[PDB]
CSV table of C-alpha atoms in Angstrom, one decimal:
chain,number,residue,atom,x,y,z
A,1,UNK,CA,0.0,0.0,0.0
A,2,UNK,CA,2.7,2.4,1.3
A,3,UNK,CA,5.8,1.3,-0.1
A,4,UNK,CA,8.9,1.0,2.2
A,5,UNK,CA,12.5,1.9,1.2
A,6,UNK,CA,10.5,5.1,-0.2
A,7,UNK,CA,9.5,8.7,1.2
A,8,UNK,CA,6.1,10.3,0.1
A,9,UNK,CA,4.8,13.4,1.2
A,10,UNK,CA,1.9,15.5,0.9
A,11,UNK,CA,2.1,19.3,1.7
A,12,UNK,CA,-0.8,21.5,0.4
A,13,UNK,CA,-0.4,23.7,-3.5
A,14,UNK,CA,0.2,27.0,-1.7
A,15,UNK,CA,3.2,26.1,0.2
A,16,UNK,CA,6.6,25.9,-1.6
A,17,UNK,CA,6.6,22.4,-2.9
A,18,UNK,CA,9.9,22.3,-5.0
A,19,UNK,CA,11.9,23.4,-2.4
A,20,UNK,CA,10.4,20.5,0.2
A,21,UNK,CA,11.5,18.3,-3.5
A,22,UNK,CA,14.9,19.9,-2.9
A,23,UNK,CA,15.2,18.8,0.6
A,24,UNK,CA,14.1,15.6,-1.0
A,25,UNK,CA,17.1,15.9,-3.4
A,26,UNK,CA,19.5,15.8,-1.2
A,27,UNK,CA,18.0,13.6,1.1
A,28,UNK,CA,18.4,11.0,-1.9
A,29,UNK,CA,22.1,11.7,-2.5
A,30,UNK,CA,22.8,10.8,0.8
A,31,UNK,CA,20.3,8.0,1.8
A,32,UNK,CA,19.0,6.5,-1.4
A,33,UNK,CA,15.4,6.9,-0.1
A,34,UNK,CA,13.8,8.6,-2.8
A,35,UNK,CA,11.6,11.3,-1.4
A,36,UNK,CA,8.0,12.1,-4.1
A,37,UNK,CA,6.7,15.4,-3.0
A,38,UNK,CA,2.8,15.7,-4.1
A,39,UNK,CA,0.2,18.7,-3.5
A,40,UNK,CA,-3.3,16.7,-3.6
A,41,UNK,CA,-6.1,19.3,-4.0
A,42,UNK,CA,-8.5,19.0,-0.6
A,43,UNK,CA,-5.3,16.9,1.1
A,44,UNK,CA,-6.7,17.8,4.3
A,45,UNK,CA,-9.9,15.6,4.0
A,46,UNK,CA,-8.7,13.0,1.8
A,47,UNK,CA,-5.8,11.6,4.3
A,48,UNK,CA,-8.2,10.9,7.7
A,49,UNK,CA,-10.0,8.4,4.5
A,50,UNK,CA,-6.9,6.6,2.9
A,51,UNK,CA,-4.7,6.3,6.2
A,52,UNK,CA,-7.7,4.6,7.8
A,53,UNK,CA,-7.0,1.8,5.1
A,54,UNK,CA,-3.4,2.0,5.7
A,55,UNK,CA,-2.4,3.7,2.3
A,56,UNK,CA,-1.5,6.7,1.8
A,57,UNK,CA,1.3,8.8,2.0
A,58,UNK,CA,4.3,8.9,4.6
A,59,UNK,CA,4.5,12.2,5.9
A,60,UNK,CA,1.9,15.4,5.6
A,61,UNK,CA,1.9,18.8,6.3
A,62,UNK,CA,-0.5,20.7,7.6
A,63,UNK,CA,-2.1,23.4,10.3
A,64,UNK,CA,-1.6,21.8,13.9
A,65,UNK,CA,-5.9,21.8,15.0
A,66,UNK,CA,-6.5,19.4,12.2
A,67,UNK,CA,-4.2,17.1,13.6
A,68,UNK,CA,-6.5,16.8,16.5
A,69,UNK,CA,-8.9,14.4,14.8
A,70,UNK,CA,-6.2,12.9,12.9
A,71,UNK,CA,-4.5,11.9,16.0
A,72,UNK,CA,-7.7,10.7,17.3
A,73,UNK,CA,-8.1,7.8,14.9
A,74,UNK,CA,-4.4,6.9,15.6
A,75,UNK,CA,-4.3,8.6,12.1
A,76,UNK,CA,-0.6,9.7,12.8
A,77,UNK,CA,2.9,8.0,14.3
A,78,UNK,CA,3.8,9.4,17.7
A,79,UNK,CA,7.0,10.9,17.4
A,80,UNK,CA,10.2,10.7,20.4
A,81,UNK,CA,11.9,13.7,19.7
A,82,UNK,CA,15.5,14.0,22.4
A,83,UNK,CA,15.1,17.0,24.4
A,84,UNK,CA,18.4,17.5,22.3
A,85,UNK,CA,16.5,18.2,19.5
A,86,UNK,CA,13.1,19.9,21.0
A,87,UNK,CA,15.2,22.8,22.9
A,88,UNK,CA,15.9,24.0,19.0
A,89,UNK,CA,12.3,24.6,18.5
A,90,UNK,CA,9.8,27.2,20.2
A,91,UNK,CA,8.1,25.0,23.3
A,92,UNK,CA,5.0,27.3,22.3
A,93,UNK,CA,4.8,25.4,19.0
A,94,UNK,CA,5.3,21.6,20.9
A,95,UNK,CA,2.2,22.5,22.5
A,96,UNK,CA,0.8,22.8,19.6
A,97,UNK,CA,1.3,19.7,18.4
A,98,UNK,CA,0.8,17.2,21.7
A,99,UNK,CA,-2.5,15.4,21.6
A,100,UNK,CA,-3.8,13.6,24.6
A,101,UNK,CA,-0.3,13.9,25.8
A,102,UNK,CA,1.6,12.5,23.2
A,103,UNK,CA,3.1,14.5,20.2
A,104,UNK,CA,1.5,13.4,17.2
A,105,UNK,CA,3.9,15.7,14.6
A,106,UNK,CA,6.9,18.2,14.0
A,107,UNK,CA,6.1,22.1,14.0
A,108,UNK,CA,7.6,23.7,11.1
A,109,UNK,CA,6.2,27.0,10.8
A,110,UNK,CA,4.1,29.8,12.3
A,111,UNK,CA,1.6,32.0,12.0
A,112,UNK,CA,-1.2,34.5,13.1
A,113,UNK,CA,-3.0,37.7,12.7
A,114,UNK,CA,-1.3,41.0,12.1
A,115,UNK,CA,-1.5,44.7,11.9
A,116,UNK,CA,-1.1,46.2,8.8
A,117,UNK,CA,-1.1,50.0,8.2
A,118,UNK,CA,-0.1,52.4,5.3
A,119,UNK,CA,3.6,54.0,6.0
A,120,UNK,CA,2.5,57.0,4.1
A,121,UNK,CA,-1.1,57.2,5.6
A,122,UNK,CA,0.0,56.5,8.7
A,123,UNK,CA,3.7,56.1,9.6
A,124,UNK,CA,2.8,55.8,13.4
A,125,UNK,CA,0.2,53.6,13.4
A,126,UNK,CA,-1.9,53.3,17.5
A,127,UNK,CA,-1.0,50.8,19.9
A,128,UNK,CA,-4.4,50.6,21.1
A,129,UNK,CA,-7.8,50.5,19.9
A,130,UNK,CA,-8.9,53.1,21.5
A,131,UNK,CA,-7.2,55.8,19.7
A,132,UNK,CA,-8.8,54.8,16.9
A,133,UNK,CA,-11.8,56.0,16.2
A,134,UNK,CA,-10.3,59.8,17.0
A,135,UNK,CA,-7.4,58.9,14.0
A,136,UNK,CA,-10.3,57.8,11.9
A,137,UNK,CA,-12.2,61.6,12.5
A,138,UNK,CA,-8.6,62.7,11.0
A,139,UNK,CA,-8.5,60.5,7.9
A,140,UNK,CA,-11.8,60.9,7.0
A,141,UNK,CA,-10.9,64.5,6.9
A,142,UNK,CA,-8.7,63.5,3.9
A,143,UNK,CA,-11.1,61.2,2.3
A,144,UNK,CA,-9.8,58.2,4.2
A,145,UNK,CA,-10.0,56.2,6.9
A,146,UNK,CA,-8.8,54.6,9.9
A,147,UNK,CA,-9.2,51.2,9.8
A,148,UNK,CA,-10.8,48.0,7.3
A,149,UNK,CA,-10.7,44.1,8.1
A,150,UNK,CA,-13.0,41.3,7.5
A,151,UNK,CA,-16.1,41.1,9.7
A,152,UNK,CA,-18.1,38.7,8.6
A,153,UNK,CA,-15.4,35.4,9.7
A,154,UNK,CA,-14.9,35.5,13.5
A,155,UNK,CA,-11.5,34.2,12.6
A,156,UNK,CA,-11.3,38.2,12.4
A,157,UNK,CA,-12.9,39.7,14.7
A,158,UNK,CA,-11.8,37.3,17.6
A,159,UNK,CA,-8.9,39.1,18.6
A,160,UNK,CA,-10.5,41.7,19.9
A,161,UNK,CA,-13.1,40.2,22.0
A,162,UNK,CA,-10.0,38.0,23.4
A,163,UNK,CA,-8.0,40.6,24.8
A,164,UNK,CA,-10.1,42.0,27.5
A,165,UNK,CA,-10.7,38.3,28.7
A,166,UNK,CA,-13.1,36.3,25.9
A,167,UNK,CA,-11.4,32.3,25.6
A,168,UNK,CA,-12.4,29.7,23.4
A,169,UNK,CA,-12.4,27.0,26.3
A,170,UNK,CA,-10.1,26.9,29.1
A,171,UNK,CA,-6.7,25.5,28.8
A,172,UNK,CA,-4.6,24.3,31.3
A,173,UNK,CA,-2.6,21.3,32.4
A,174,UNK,CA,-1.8,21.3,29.0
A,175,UNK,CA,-5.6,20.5,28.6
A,176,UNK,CA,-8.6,21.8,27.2
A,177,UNK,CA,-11.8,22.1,29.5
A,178,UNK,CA,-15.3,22.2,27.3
A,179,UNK,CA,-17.3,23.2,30.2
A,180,UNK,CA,-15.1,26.0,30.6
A,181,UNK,CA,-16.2,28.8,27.3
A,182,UNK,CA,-15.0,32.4,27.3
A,183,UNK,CA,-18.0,33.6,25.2
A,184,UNK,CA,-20.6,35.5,27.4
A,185,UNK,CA,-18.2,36.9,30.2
A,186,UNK,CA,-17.3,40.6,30.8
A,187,UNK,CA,-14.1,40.5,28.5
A,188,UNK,CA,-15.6,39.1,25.3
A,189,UNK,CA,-18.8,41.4,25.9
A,190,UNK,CA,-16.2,44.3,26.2
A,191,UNK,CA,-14.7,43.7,23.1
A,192,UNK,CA,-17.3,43.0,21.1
A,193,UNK,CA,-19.1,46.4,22.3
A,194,UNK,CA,-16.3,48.1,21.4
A,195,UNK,CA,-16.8,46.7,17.8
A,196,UNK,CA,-20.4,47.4,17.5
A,197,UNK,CA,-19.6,51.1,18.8
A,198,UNK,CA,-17.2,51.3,15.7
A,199,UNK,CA,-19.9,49.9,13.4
A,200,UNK,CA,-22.2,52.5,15.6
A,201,UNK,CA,-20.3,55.3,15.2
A,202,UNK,CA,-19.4,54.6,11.2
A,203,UNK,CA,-16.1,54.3,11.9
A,204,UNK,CA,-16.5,50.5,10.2
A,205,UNK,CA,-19.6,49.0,7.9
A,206,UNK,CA,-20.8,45.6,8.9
A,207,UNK,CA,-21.1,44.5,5.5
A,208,UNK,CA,-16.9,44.8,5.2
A,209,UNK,CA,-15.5,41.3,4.1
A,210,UNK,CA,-12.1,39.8,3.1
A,211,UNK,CA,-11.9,40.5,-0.1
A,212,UNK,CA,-13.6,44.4,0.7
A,213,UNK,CA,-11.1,45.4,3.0
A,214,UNK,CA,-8.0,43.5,0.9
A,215,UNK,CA,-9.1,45.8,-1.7
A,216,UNK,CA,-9.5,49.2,-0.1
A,217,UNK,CA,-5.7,48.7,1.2
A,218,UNK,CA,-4.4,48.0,-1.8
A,219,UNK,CA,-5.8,50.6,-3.4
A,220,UNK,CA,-5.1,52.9,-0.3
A,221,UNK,CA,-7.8,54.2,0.7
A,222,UNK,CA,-7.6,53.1,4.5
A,223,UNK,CA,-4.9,53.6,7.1
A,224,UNK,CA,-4.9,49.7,8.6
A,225,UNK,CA,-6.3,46.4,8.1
A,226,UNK,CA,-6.4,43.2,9.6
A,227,UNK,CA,-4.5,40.5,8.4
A,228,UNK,CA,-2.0,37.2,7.8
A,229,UNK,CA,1.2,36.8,5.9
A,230,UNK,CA,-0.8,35.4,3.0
A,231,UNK,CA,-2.1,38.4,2.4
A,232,UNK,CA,1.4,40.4,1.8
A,233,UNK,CA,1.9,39.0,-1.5
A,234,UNK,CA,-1.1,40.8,-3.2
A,235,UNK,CA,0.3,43.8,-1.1
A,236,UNK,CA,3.6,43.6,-2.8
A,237,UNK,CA,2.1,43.7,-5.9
A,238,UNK,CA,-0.1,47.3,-5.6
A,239,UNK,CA,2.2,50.7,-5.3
A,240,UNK,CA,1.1,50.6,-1.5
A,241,UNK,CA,4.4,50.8,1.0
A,242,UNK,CA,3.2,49.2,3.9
A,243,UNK,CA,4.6,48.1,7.1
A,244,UNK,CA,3.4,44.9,9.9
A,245,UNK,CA,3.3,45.3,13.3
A,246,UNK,CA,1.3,44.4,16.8
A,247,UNK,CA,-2.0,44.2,16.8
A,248,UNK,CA,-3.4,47.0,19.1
A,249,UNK,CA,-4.2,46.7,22.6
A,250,UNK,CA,-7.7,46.7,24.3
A,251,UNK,CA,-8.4,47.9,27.6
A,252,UNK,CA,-4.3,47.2,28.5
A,253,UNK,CA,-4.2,44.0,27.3
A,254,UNK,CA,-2.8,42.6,24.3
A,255,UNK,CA,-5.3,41.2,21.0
A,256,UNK,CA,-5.0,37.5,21.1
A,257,UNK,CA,-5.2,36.3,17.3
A,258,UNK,CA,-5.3,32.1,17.2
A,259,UNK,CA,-1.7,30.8,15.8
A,260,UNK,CA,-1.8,28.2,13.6
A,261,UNK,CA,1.4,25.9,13.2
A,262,UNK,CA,2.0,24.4,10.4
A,263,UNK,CA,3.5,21.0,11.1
A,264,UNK,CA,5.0,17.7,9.5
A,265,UNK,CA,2.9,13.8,10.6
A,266,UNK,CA,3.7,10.8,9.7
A,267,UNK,CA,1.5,8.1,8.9
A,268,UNK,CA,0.9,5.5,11.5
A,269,UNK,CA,0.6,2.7,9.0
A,270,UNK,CA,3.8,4.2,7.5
A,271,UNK,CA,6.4,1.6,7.0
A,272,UNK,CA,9.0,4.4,7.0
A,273,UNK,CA,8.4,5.9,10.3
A,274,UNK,CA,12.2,6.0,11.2
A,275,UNK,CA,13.4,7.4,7.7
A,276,UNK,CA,10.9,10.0,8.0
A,277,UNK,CA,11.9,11.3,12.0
A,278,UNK,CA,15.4,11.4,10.0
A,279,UNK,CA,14.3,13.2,7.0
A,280,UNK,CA,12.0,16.2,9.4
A,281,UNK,CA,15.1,16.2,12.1
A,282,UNK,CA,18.2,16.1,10.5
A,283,UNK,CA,16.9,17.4,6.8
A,284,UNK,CA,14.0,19.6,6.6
A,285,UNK,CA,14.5,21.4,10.1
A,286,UNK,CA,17.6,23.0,9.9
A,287,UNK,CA,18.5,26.7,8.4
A,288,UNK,CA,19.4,24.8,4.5
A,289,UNK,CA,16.3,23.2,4.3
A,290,UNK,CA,13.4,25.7,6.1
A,291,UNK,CA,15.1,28.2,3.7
A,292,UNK,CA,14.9,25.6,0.8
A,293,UNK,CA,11.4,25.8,1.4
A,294,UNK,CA,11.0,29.4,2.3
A,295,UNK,CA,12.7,30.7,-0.8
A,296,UNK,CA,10.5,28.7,-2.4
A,297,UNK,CA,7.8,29.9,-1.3
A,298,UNK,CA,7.6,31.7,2.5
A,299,UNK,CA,6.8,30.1,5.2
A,300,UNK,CA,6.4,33.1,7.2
A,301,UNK,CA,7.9,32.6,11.2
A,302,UNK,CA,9.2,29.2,11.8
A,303,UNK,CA,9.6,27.0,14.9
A,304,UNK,CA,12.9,26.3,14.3
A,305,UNK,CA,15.0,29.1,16.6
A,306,UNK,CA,17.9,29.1,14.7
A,307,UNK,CA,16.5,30.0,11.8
A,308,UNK,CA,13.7,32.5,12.4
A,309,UNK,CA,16.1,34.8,14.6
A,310,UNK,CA,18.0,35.6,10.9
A,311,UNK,CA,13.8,35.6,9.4
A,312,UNK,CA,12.9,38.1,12.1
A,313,UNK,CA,15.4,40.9,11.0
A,314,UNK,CA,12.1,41.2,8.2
A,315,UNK,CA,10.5,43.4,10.4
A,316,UNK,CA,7.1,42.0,9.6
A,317,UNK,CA,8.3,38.6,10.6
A,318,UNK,CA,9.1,39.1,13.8
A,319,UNK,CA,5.8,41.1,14.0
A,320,UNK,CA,4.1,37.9,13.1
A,321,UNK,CA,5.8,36.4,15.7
A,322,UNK,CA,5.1,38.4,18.1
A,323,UNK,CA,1.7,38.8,17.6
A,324,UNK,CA,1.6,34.8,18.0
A,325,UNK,CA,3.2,34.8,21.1
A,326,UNK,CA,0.7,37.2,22.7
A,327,UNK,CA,-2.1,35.0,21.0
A,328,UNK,CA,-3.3,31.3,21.8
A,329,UNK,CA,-2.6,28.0,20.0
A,330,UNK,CA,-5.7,27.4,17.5
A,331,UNK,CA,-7.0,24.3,20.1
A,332,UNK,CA,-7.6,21.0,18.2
A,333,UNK,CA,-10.1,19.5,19.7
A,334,UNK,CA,-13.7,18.9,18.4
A,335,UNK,CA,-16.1,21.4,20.0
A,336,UNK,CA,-14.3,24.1,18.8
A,337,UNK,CA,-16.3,23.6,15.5
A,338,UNK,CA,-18.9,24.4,17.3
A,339,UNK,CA,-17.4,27.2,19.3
A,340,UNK,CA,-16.9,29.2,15.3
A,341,UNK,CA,-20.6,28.1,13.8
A,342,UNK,CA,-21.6,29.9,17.4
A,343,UNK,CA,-19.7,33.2,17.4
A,344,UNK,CA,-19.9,33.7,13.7
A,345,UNK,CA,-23.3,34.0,14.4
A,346,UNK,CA,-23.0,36.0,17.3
A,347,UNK,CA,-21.0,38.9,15.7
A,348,UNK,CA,-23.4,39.0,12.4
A,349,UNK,CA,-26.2,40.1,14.4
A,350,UNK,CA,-24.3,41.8,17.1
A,351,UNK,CA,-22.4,43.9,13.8
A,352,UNK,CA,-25.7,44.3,12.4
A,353,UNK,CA,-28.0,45.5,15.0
A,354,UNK,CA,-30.4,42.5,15.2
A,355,UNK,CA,-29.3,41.4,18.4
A,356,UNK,CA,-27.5,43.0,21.6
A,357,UNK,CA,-24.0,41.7,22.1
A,358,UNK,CA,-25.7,40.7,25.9
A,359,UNK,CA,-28.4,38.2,24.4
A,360,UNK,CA,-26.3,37.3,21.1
A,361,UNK,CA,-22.7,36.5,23.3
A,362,UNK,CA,-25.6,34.2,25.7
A,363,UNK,CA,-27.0,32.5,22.8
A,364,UNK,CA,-23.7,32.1,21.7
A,365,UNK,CA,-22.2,30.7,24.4
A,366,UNK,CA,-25.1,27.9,24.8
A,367,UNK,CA,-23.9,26.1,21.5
A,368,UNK,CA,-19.9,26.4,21.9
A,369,UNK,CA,-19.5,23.0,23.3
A,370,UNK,CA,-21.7,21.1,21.3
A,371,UNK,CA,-19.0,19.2,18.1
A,372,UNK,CA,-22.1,20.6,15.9
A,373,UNK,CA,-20.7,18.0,12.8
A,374,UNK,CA,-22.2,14.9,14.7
A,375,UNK,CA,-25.6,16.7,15.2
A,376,UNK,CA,-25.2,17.8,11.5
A,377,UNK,CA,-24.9,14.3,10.4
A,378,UNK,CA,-28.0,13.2,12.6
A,379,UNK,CA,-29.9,15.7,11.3
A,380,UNK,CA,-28.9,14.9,7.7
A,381,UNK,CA,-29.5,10.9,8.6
A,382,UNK,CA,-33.1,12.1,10.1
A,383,UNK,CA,-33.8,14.3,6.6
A,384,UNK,CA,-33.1,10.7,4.8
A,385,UNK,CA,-35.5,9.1,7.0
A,386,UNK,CA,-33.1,7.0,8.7
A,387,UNK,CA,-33.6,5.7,11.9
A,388,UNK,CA,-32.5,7.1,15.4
A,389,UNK,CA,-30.7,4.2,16.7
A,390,UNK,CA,-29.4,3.9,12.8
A,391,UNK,CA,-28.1,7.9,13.0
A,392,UNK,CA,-26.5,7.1,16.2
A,393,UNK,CA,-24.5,4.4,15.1
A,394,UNK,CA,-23.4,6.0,12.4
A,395,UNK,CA,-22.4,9.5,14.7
A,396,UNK,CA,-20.3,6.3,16.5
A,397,UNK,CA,-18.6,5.6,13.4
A,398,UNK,CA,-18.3,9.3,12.6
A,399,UNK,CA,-16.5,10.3,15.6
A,400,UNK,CA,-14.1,7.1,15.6
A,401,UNK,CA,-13.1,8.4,12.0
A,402,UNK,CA,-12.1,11.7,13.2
A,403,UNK,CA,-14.6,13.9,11.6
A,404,UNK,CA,-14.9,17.3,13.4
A,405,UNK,CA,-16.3,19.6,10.9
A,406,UNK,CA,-19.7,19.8,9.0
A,407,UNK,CA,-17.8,19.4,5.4
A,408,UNK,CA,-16.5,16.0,7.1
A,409,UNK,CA,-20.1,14.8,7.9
A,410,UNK,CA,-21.6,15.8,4.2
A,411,UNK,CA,-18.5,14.0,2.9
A,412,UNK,CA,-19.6,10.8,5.3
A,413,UNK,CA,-23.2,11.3,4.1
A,414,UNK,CA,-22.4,11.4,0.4
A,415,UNK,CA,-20.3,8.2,0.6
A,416,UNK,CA,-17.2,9.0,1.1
A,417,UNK,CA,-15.3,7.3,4.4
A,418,UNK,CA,-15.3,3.8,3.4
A,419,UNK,CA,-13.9,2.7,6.4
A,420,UNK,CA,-16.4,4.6,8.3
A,421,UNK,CA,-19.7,3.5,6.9
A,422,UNK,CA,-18.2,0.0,7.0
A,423,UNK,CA,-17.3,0.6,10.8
A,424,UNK,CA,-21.3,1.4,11.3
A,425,UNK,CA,-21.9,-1.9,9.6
A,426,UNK,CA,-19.7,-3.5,11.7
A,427,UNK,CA,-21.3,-1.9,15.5
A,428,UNK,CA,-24.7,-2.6,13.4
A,429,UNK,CA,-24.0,-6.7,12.8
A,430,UNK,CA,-22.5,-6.9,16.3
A,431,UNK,CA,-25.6,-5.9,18.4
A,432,UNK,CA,-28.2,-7.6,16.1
A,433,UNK,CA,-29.5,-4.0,14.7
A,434,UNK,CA,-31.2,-5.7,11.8
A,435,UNK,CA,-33.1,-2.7,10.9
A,436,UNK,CA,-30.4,0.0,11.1
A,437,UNK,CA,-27.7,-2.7,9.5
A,438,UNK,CA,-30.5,-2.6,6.5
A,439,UNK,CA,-31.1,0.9,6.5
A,440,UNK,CA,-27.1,1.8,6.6
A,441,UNK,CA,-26.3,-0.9,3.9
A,442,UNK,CA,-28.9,1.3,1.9
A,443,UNK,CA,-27.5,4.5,2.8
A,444,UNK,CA,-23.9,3.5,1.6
């Protein structure tokens, strides 16, 4: 299935790919393992399928939170990293990869939310929020103004609410508590007032999206915006001279954007597991090989230490970095699908005046917990006609594969997750369930 004596990896199209295949070049001079470097479109949901067969490839990059569910299904190899080796690495970014205790893949690179501003709009951008809406009185004076990022994606607009005290759920003992949600208490209300004021007081539109704001930068006609390292490139490209820095602070305390890491696995049916540790150690994580990569295409800040101290004298990189360090690790665990579906919501109407950010951050905060792609799936199965007990079983099957998001149940419900449905079968022949086993057979 996965052949041994071989290296195959899967990193997603927008990453640098050719230079990972030039890691992979000399990783063959040396070895004689011969390392095939392939960007599948939608990588991301095809692997939890084929690895749960045992194909697939060796190794796969991607953001840390997706590894949660991965890691679940025993998707990935656990990895035994010397503290040799982890002391060259951000501990920040080990966290982000350690599931249930155990770390599950290598951190590569980092990212997170940023503030952009115009140099020649603004070449002092604030360090708080609060001076904002006074420098926006000032551009609009010239026809400007102060400030544009998306507000429809709570991705967004989280920040914000975070830094007076909002939390996803509570994380310690290197542990995530889903009784424990940050939504409705006095710091997230705080923020988000202070966000409905600036849609209030016009200093913002609700109606401002991603690809609204990208544009009024670019074309310069507001001071800051919102946004990640992806975004620089089209920046690059217009007569704009911009400049990166901290997002600003709320009430004192720092905006908390979620960091995503973007991080190596390896297959747990992998037949290569000790070429590959060898490979992401000693090849790909050093300064030759993240810059490989990075010239390739950037990678942004990277966990390796070495490395991003000579990427950080970019200005904007070690603004990225920064940033991520006053933020929190995007958590991988389930509920936190929920937690976005919730306070997506929960701004919309807040932004647009159809609820108050009181009873819309309390409705909110009811449905955080609740890993809505199970309930999805139910609800699908039910629309079929399917059977409660039948449903149920299949939610079984769907949480043993690892499926966390709604895009992972209509996936499941369409037929895909072979493995899966079979699974169902399996739980359905087991307890004598003759009328769900008929009903799922029919279903798949």
């Amino acid at each position: 299935k996965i052949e041994e004596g071989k290296l195959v990896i899967w990193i997603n199209g927008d990453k640098g790919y050719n230079g990972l295949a030039e890691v992979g070049k000399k990783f063959e001079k040396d070895t004689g393992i011969k390392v095939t470097v392939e960007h599948p479109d939608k990588l991301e949901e095809k692997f939890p399928q084929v690895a749960a067969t045992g194909d697939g490839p060796d190794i796969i990059f991607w953001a840390h939170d997706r590894f949660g569910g991965y890691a679940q299904s025993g998707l990935l190899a656990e990895i035994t990293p010397a503290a040799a080796f982890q002391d060259k690495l951000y501990p920040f970014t080990w966290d982000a990869v350690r599931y249930n205790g155990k770390l599950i893949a290598y951190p590569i690179a980092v990212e997170a939310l940023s503030l952009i501003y115009n140099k020649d709009l603004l070449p002092n951008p604030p360090k708080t929020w609060e001076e904002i809406p006074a420098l926006d009185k000032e551009l609009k004076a010239k026809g400007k103004s102060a400030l544009m990022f998306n507000l429809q994606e709570p991705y967004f607009t989280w920040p914000l609410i975070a830094a007076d005290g909002g939390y996803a759920f509570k994380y310690a003992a290197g542990k995530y508590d889903i009784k424990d949600v940050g939504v409705d208490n006095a710091g997230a209300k705080a923020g988000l007032t202070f966000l409905v004021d600036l849609i209030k007081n016009k200093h913002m539109n609700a109606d401002t999206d991603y690809s609204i704001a990208e544009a009024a930068f670019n074309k310069g006609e507001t001071a800051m915006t919102i946004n990640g390292p992806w975004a620089w490139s089209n920046i690059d490209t217009s007569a704009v001279n911009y400049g990166v820095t901290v997002l600003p602070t709320f009430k004192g305390q720092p905006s908390k954007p979620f960091v995503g890491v973007l991080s190596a696995g390896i297959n747990a049916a992998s037949p290569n597991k000790e070429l590959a540790k060898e490979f992401l150690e000693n090849y790909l994580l050093t300064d030759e090989g993240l810059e490989a990569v990075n010239k390739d295409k950037p990678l942004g800040a990277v966990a390796l230490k070495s490395y991003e101290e000579e990427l950080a004298k970019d200005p904007r990189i070690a603004a990225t970095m920064e940033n991520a360090q006053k933020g929190e690790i995007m958590p991988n665990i389930p509920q936190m699908s929920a937690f976005w579906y919730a306070v997506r919501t929960a701004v919309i109407n807040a932004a647009s005046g159809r609820q108050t950010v009181d009873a819309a951050l309390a409705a909110a905060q009811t449905n955080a917990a609740r890993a809505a792609a199970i309930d999805i799936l139910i609800k699908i199965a039910k629309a079929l006609g399917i059977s409660d007990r039948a449903a149920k079983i299949l939610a079984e099957a769907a949480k043993a594969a690892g499926i966390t998001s709604a895009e992972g149940a209509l996936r499941l419900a369409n037929g895909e997750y072979p493995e899966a449905w079979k699974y169902a079968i399996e739980l359905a022949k087991k307890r004598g369930d003759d009328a769900a086993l008929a009903a799922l057979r029919r279903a798949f």
